[PDB]
Write a protein that binds this DNA or RNA. Structure first.
Ligand SMILES: Nc1ncnc2c1ncn2[C@@H]1O[C@H](COP(=O)(O)OP(=O)(O)OP(=O)(O)O)[C@@H](O)[C@H]1O
Ligand SMILES: Nc1ncnc2c1ncn2[C@@H]1O[C@H](COP(=O)(O)OP(=O)(O)OP(=O)(O)O)[C@@H](O)[C@H]1O
Ligand SMILES: Nc1ncnc2c1ncn2[C@@H]1O[C@H](COP(=O)(O)OP(=O)(O)OP(=O)(O)O)[C@@H](O)[C@H]1O
Ligand SMILES: Nc1ncnc2c1ncn2[C@@H]1O[C@H](COP(=O)(O)OP(=O)(O)OP(=O)(O)O)[C@@H](O)[C@H]1O
Ligand SMILES: Nc1ncnc2c1ncn2[C@@H]1O[C@H](COP(=O)(O)OP(=O)(O)OP(=O)(O)O)[C@@H](O)[C@H]1O
Lengths: 362, 362, 362, 362, 362
DNA sequence: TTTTTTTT
């Protein structure tokens, strides 16, 4: 009896899988008895346990096929085709709206009954992040709209401050929230072409840790990056399309994505200073160090790195109207959860503790 | 029954699509019952909502096919094949006439009942552009004549001026108008081999901000561009066919397109200067800057970059006799719509406002 | 019923096509009723309207087929096979005789009843070329013999002088006449290898403006050209076979064709000097400059650089016995047409006009 | 009603054709009625007229097939396979015995009833050749045996010095005689590692004007040639197998053929120089130029570069005992014809003219 | 009826053929009747005449097949798989035991029914091999222990001493008995890092003459050798797995095999010598060069290079118990064939002919 | 499988 290629493709769509080998392996597992499946019973992975029951029948026939890799190819093509349709047609607002739906799906599992994540510890993260910069929550909302509107010239933000001052931590959480990529531009100029190649179809980019020239008088090690950026004006201003390259692959032409730049106190040419919308100073604050020293579970679980943490901050601080209308229904349910889960006083006690440099919890 | 490969080919032809994945993803959207299609109801994409109902039945059968990518590859071949047939058999004038028809179709949508753009905002951009150079519309017609005739060794125009004097802005508009590609010649002198490969079958090309060398009193970063261009005199001259290459492709051969070179005020080896028909000196101007600062919607919607803006200028300024005969019919209708919309006094008000450096609209 | 692959192959033989996409594109056009076919009614392209009625019945079936690119590939390889058989078995004289029939056929169209070209404008071109050098028509007869005899280490002519001397123009016309290829050697020493692969099965080749070294003493930037050719002596000599790459293909092995090298004046190693059988120096002549400046349809139609103009020059000047015996009938016909179409006095006055730098015509 | 792939393969064997396009082109000629075949009637090519009638019926059925290239690919592979099997099984003396039978069969045609050339002219060539250096036939007989006995690190003779010494002239004739290959050392060593792959299954090889270093006293431009000679010294010595590259097929390892190499009088180290046997740089004899100047049909017909000239010279001079036994029949058969044509006084008269700078005949 | 794919696969295992072209070619020969197969009748090639009669029926049907190359590809895969299994499963001991069995089978063939070799020739070869230093049969055998044992550190000896000493000739000869390869060492380690990877998967390895840094100052031309291996702490030592590259490949890495190094009488820093268990000076000693000046067959038929000569030096001097335990049966029988034909005294005449430079054969 | 890349 015949295999349904359709049922495979539906699984690939719903897992959003795009690796042929990864798709193949997981479908083959469904061939074993669903009714006894140990992986189902232990509820180990949703991509398995949500689906084994449905696909078991087809997986048995799949296991006898001789066309196995061919079936998977057509399935994975369908997922890649969907992405390319989306990329060429969605509004940037709708792109973001999808991305939040994915994070909210993950949170539903994480804080579920089988979920590992301690909603209390993750809210300790938000308390710490909200201390990192004044008006933190508004700053995020401003950055977000800036990426969505993507207005020419008004496109790029500068993070400035000493080593161990948090700028990478915040950048990483934003990049997770938005699904960009990091880039390094300190290379010899000829090398840049495949670096910039990374940007293709990305929503954000982060230029990490740009080195200037001079300031080794202040022990800042010198390098190319500042001068390279001054030479890339059209990519920053983002008014016109540019050509981007990948290894073995034809060039593609597109608007260069908006993004973030991070540095120590190198001297910045006035040319570059005109490019940035906002400069944010990061400074080491001694009380945060002593707090982290007493609340290491933040680092151990990588809480303060995560876009998941920033999304919780937005849900706590921003009005429901500020989110894209379609997801507001989920937002209200999460607001309701958090309102039930914490009094404002217990949350505010954490902020006070962080200001004491004391461990977050008491 | 069975898939009609013919219907898929027709869809590819009508959408003028030449990505196999985009075609695949697009066609798959039609598999759902037409009568409920929210994309149709929301009138989001004409390349969807025109076609769903017609293609529906075959899209459902296609969804079951075991052969899907083969069908799409054949369809994309016919679209690519038509481009090559046209490249060899059309006159350069006919090409331009076709390109204009496409832009005019986009203009029918933009300013159509879907109401999706403001014809007044777009007309403001023409005022700002008609300021950017003396006799601006005459310069466009001369450039168009130059590009249609394609006189050998009289094929290239040189743009120079300081930074911030609009030259890439003007190049971008001409490039969207004609169709073509930009190129970067400041590369290492080997990968030029693949860089120049982008010129294949194009109509224009633009070489962007070619770096000269030395004279650093000019405060100009040095690079390969000028000396490297002087090693490519042949490609400018366009007197004989040349050989062109892409990744994994064996060489095409054809005449290298006509086009534009842009640079800062470096000094030119006159052997290359001998290959430029005409040279245009851009100046920074204050009232442009002040007007533009008070007219930001121009930039926020990329109006002054966009080929539609130049086409609107020609329609306003030029006699109907100057257009190729078949589109004179559409040109007349657009002229009527413009004169209906705008008095000459309104246009003169706008131009005076640009000259006054106030926000254009008053 | 089924597609005839044989009929497709026959059309490819008839058209002497080579791009599988060009073949595919053009054959698809026949699917519409030739009865109505607008292109036929315009009589626009002979490659179409001579064949549409014949191929229509089979094109309708081809339009449905699932194999289309496969059918086309077989036909293209049939044409390529024919070329290889010809290349291995014709005398060089017969090859040229075939090539001349192709030009004569086009000329029968050029000045046919459809008569898109004016024979008087085209004859004006011949006068300008005959003026360009001493004994021009004798020089052309010499060059043809040299290329046909293909005597080893007596195979290459060097053109040199200043810029705008016309050397490229003359090369371009000779190249068109014999149907060679043009090659660049001012290039990366590695990728020369795929570059030279173009010359497989070609009758003739031309190297363009081969850059010398130490040239900038004379205002000429130095380059790879001479530095490359001094290696390739065996390719010039044509005394022994050499082996030729193509991308994704194993090497051919054959004698490298005879040809021409152009340069602006540079120092030549005496080793390389020994391998050019003839030297020609070209000089600017301001009366020619003024004449083209008036008679600019010469440039716009590219008349002065067509091999058709050289063929016409030979027809006017050379005895019929100098032509290969087969074509002598068509030669007598065209001689008679031309002697009828122009007096000697007309041609004499054209020369005086050109000599006097006035526009050619009065 | 079906193609005999066997009959196709027999033609490929009997022609010893080993190019798939060449065979394809060849066989398709047979589809027309051999009855009318102008090539047959003309006795145009033996590869045609011997075979047309035999293969006609099969060729008509082949002309309709849809597998045409696949059929030819299998046929070509049997030819390459046969070469490989002979290549390892046969004695080096046995190889030459086959090669000579090939050339003799050609001479049968050249001087046949078709008689397209005449032994008169060719013997004048022999006179010019045997004149060129002392005792020429003997030193050829030596070089032959050297290549049969193939002593390791003793496999190579060299010629050096003046341009137009004739060293290429001598080399080319030897290569046409043996059926070796020629290769170029002067490319980047990496490219050589692929290029040397052509040496597969060759009795003999040569390399021409390999660019050494120094010799600037003689204005010789230095290069990578000797660098890569100094590299490949195992290939030179043939004391061991080494690997040989191909595209789309495995590289194969075997011992390397013997040969000749030639250069201008560059430097090259004695870690080479000592190896070689019986090297002769030889230098001009001007009166030969003057005979040549008067006997130019030699060069036009490439006679003094044809290996057929050498074979005629050996037939003329050498005892019948000097040759392998089977061919001694045909040796005598030809040696009769030389006597039957020529008195000694003919050859004597020729060598007077040659010695005395007049054209060979009087 | 149909081709047995199985029978074709047997012949590949039988002949150990592993080239698809050779397999195809030889198998096609069997299509004629073995019954009067003249190759069989002449007994020329066992790889033919041993098999023809069995395979004939299958070969006839094979010659009629249309899939022929596909059949052969599978058969060659079989032999390749068979090899790759053994390469992973077996000990160096077992591997070397098989290798002796093969070379002893070549010994059997050489001195076989044909008498194609006369062992006295190889006694003279062995007598020459004996000359170099005392008991060197044992010292070879003891090195071969070091090779099989591959005990860490205890892996490497150094062949010091000048040109033509045979030291590379002998090191190469072991590659017949054992496989392996030699490599250069005289760039800075910088480049040699791209060259070390040819040591991968080698049974054993060899290294060419270590130059001293600036060694021209020591009258031995320069190259950066010693300071490279002064500092490659581990590579010759070989406890744990090393890291390596073949230029433009990847770091598949494992143990660095044991091997030989040589030098042309250069100097040695301590950490270079620490790489070896031994260092020995090799010279082209006076009577030895004189005996080669007087003894020729030992070079002419490559005896001095062949592994067969090394095997016989061991059979002539190593006692049976030292050999591969089952092969010792054959070792006795060859020892018998030695003693059957030579006393040690007649062999001592040869030793003394070498020892006093007079020609060996006597 | 090459090609492109990588090296350069
Ligand atoms: N504002 C801060 N005050 C004190 N300590 C900080 C602060 N921000 C970060 N930290 C400490 O610095 C460590 C590294 O943080 P982070 O990577 O964000 O710093 P950074 O300045 O962006 O570094 P880099 O420039 O190296 O990428 C954190 O794990 C934490 O221990
Ligand atoms: N003539 C002008 N005078 C003043 N400001 C100008 C002028 N033209 C452009 N601008 C401003 O400069 C910005 C950049 O324009 P554009 O990028 O085309 O110029 P450019 O710097 O000269 O270009 P290029 O990249 O070719 O060197 C515009 O978006 C506008 O804000
Ligand atoms: N002898 C001449 N006298 C004056 N003008 C000339 C002459 N020959 C050519 N021209 C002008 O020079 C233009 C370029 O000619 P052409 O490209 O053949 O010259 P070239 O010497 O080969 O140049 P380059 O070195 O730039 O390739 C022609 O189109 C014509 O306008
Ligand atoms: N003995 C000779 N005297 C004069 N000219 C000679 C003599 N031998 C050969 N030549 C000339 O040398 C020309 C080229 O021959 P060939 O290519 O064999 O020489 P070559 O020394 O190998 O040259 P190169 O080093 O330039 O390749 C011949 O066409 C002939 O005219
Ligand atoms: N002891 C010897 N004396 C003289 N000649 C010898 C001796 N041994 C071998 N030969 C001959 O010299 C040739 C070269 O020997 P080989 O290359 O092995 O010496 P080498 O000392 O390793 O030299 P190099 O240091 O130059 O590589 C041998 O193949 C053989 O023909």
């Amino acid at each position: 009896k015949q295999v349904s290629w359709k049922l495979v493709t539906e699984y690939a769509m719903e897992t959003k899988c795009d690796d042929v080998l990864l798709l193949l392996g997981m479908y083959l597992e469904f061939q074993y008895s669903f009714e006894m499946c140990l992986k189902c019973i232990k509820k180990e992975q949703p991509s398995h346990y949500k689906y084994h029951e449905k696909h078991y029948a087809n997986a048995a026939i799949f296991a006898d096929s001789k066309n196995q890799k061919t079936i998977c190819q057509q399935a994975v093509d369908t997922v890649l085709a969907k992405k390319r349709v989306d990329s060429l047609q969605l509004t940037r607002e709708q792109m973001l709206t999808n991305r939040f739906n994915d994070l909210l799906d993950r949170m539903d599992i994480m804080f579920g009954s089988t979920g590992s994540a301690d909603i209390e510890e993750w809210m300790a993260g938000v308390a710490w992040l909200h201390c990192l910069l004044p008006k933190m929550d508004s700053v995020v909302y401003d950055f977000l709209k800036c990426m969505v509107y993507n207005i020419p010239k008004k496109r790029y933000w500068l993070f400035k401050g000493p080593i161990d001052s948090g700028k990478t931590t915040l950048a990483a959480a934003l990049l997770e929230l938005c699904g960009g990529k990091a880039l390094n531009v300190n290379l010899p100029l000829d090398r840049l072409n495949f670096e910039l190649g990374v940007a293709i179809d990305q929503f954000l980019v982060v230029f990490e840790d740009v080195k200037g020239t001079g300031g080794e008088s202040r022990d800042l090690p010198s390098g190319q990056g500042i001068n390279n950026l001054d030479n890339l004006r059209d990519y920053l201003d983002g008014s016109v399309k540019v050509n981007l390259e990948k290894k073995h692959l034809n060039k593609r032409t597109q608007i260069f994505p908006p993004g973030i730049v991070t540095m120590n106190e190198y001297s910045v040419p006035k040319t570059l200073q005109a490019r940035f919308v906002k400069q944010i100073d990061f400074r080491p604050k001694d009380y945060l160090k002593h707090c982290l020293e007493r609340s290491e579970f933040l680092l151990e679980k990588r809480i303060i790195q995560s876009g998941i943490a920033l999304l919780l901050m937005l849900i706590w601080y921003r009005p429901v109207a500020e989110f894209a209308q379609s997801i507001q229904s989920r937002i209200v349910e999460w607001k309701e959860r958090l309102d039930k889960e914490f009094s404002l006083s217990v949350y505010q006690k954490m902020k006070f503790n962080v200001a004491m440099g004391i461990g977050v919890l008491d």
